[PDB]
Design a protein that fits this description.
This is part of a larger assembly, with one copy of chain A (337 residues), one copy of chain B (75 residues) and two copies of chain C (319 residues).
Chain A: E1 2-7, H1 11-22, E2 29-35, H2 40-48, E3 49-50, E4 54-55, E5 61-63, E6 67-70, E7 73-78, E8 95-98, H3 106-114, E9 119-123, E10 148-151, H4 154-169, E11 172-182, E12 208-212, H5 217-221, E13 229-236, E14 241-250, H6 256-269, E15 275-278, E16 294-297, E17 302-303, E18 309-316, H7 320-333
Parallel strand pairs in A: 1-2, 1-8, 2-7, 8-9, 9-10, 11-13, 15-16
Antiparallel strand pairs in A: 3-4, 5-6, 6-7, 11-14, 12-13, 14-18, 16-18, 17-18
Helix pairs in contact in A: 1-7, 4-6
Chain B: H1 3-21, H2 27-51, H3 57-63
Helix pairs in contact in B: 1-2
Chain C: E1 3-8, H1 17-25, E2 31-32, H2 44-50, H3 62-73, E3 78-83, E4 90-96, E5 101-106, E6 121-125, H4 129-142, H5 151-165, E7 175-181, E8 194-201, E9 211-212, E10 217-225, E11 236-243, E12 248-255, H6 262-268, E13 271-272, H7 281-287, H8 298-318
Parallel strand pairs in C: 1-5, 1-6, 2-5, 6-7
Antiparallel strand pairs in C: 3-4, 7-8, 8-12, 9-13, 11-12
Helix pairs in contact in C: 1-8
The chains are: A alpha/beta (337), B mainly alpha (75), C alpha/beta (319).
The structure holds nicotinamide-adenine-dinucleotide.
Residues 8-13, 35-37, 81, 99-102, 123-124, 153-154, 184-185, 317-318, 321 of chain A line the site of nicotinamide-adenine-dinucleotide.
Amino acid sequence: MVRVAINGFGRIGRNFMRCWLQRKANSKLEIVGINDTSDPRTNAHLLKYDSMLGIFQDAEITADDDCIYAGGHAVKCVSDRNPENLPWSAWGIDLVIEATGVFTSREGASKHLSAGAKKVLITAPGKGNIPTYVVGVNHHTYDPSEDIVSNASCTTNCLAPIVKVLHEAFGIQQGMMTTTHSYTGDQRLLDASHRDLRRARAAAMNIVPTSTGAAKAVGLVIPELQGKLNGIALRVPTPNVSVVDFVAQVEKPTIAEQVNQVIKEASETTMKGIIHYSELELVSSDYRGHNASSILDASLTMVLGGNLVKVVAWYDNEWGYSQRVLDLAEHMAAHWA
Amino acid sequence: MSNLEKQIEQAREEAHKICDTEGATSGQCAAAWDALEELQAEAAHQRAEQQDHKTSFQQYCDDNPDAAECRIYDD
Amino acid sequence: RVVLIGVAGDSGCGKSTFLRRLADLFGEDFMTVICLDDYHSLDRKQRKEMGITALDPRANNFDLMYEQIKALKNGESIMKPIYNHETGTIDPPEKVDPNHVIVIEGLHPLYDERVRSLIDFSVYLDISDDVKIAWKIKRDMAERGHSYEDVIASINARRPDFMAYIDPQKQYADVVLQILPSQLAKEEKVGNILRVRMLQREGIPGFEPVYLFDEGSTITWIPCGRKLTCSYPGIRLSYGPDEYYGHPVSVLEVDGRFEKLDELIYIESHLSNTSTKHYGEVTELLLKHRDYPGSDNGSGLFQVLTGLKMRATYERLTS
Amino acid sequence: RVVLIGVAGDSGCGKSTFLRRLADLFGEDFMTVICLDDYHSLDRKQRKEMGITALDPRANNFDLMYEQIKALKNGESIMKPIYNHETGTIDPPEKVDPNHVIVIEGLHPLYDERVRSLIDFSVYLDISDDVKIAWKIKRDMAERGHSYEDVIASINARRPDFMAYIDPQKQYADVVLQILPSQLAKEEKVGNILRVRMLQREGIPGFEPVYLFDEGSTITWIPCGRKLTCSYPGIRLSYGPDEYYGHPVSVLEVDGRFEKLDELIYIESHLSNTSTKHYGEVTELLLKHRDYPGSDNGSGLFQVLTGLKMRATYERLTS
Ligand SMILES: NC(=O)c1ccc[n+]([C@@H]2O[C@H](COP(=O)([O-])OP(=O)(O)OC[C@H]3O[C@@H](n4cnc5c(N)ncnc54)[C@H](O)[C@@H]3O)[C@@H](O)[C@H]2O)c1
């Protein structure tokens, strides 16, 4: 049993905690420590009453000022912004889950390793050559001495299994993407001062575009496509779920039905539990809480000229990404060294 | 169908009569069976159009398209 | 310009899915449909009085249809009469206009020789008598009219003049599609799986043949094997040079039932001179309408192949 | 380097024209011939005393042939004994030297498993019993020895142990050529036209198959038609993926008689992966020897195709 911790009890942290509360019996992981910038009275309320996933129902949530009782299970909790003053060796922490969006560097994330933690899994595309791993693509090829691992962004975590399937079946020369992304917490609500100008504007009002390198992270997790994948993101006023457009330029020519057939059988042989395949005419809010990290929308797949394919993929960047974080954490627990 | 429903059976009676009586292999009752097959063909054309009977949408959007149930701003 | 397409068959005018596949290919904006039962001379009353079928070269005004057909080339809006089908009578005519593509289809689209000199591309569509019976059983079974098994005796009574009146037109058509009972499958009803063959004619330029791996040497190919896991019974193609009615033809022939996708793209990757601007375009044109009758067998393959050659002839005629 | 080629068949050692076609291909400068009746244990006197044929795994010193075969790789001149064929006895050996290409041919070139691990490329050569009878009739007819029609009873007496001793070697050979009576022609004697087929095996690299128009989908092609005027009866090829003895094979099959030149170049232009550096090289290798038996049918086609694959394996082994 592996004692794990959570740095930053935000959206990813609350979803990680809720996922572990829903996957408790099959777990080699026991969540024993969290730390947020809030007191332990508030974040227990925010855990129980999520305005996106409704009221939690299965287990009882309560807290006092030093611990949080989730379903009778106790969990410790502290508050500090310095990662160096944190009781890790005092709590016996193998794996800490970096989810603050602050400690993306190696030198930032390694502060927990210095302060007495054994491995760190950071839920962000980290700066510098941090080894990145996506469940369903290359979650096998990590060396267990790599204590500082990184899951990529949610967009990369959705996009990379589709790109893996299409690269194996057809071969990819180039590829664009344009993810229509739900608004995240970084954007200011009204027009307030912010480091980047396109995130400074109002979130509920605007399609704000942004440039991301998270398309290039597929070139990290798939090495032979690096420098060939690039794309932008569009933040639109939907709170939870998002869709990603993906334009690839394959070289083995095909039609629109065949790529759907390929991804449909890949959903049932290898990418089971990663890619779901849906031939329904659903819309965005029917994917709040879906377990797969990419639902391929079947009716919109199209091929022009044989060698130019477009797919779109629904994905929940708050629930499915947390599911892949927890699956990667359990998969590194199963190969603990 | 009631009119051609009767007329097909009437031409079937004639097919039993004229091609047993006035020559089983000649142009007359071959014209009779050709007629009955055309009556059958128009029964088929009636049948396929009643298979394609719309329920509501190609009625309510046939007469009143701009209602909120079938505005399509295919844009 | 005015182009013209002749279709021949007794599948009912506007009552066959080949016109539906042409509609999916061209569009009813670019083409218009002309039935040819409209040019009947007189009615079913006068058919009973004259003792004559709807197949007589007396029974149509073949000259006024020619005058409207020639006036179609000159751009003017034609005024064609209409056979009132329920009564057997004749409507006062309708003024319809020409289009980019004009089709002609009926029992005698090709019996006239001046219009045979006029038609830019011709298709006869043949049916064997067995699947005639298998389609009439479905005709009087789905309707439950209870008129079966003397229609068997209507078949051979409709037969003899039909072979005199209609079947010598196929000696002048370009492409003729025969549909046979399947030699491959035996333990079914006699109309499930079709053994279809599109006897296409050489000679007249613009029309290429579609040859399977070689022009002019008979080749019977079964695509089952290392890359396709065939179901029962799978496909069994054919090909062969031939001389039908003393004319240089090239039969391309398919027996079987298309059960899935990869066995229908793998066949299409190996046909040649199919005149596509698009890879797998024939498979897309198969699967834009999964509900059409005969999409699962070679009939829907051959009909869209002929329509794709009609695209080729249209591009030849319009540069 | 030392390369090695295994040939298996009861056509008499050095008594089949496939070795002659290999001689026309490589040259007796580059290759040497090794019969395998030379490694017999004891004589026809001891065959009569022990009551045993020349097909017994007792009847050969399988270890000393292996020692000379392994010493062939090391470059030294081997010292091989010789079966005195007229007496049945054994010559004191001859010191022969290795060459660029070494062949091995006999009744058991492949029965040993260490030499099966040694042989670089293997060929079994099968014969159906009908053309066995048709060749023995020519054997005792041209010689006029008058020993016929009880050799028919020698056939089935030679049969049963032969299927035990020899025929399980073909489960380990690469290429096996079966020769059958022709289904195509009926009103001849039973050995004129052959129905031959070269079951070749996938797997082991360097050896490609030779596929007719498609890898792995059965295709029966007749090259008669618009460009070839076929005589009687003409050719009828075949092809097919198959699994023989649970092994991934690809039968390429020819029935007919090559009567002229253009029908033999037109076939050769359409085979694929035949590994020629030269256009029509297979046709030239057919017609460098018009007098060889079996040049007019597919046996001479398949033998030189196998020898051309032996060129391919030799170029793979010598870079
Ligand atoms: N928002 C999404 O749906 C999503 C999807 C994939 C990945 N991510 C990544 O997850 C990370 C966090 O996302 P989020 O929505 O939970 O962020 P958030 O800002 O909503 O929540 C982060 C929490 O961490 C706390 N925190 C910040 N710095 C801290 C520090 N130094 N010490 C302690 N607590 C600290 C914040 O106050 C807040 O409580 C970011 O890297 C984000 O890019 C987000």
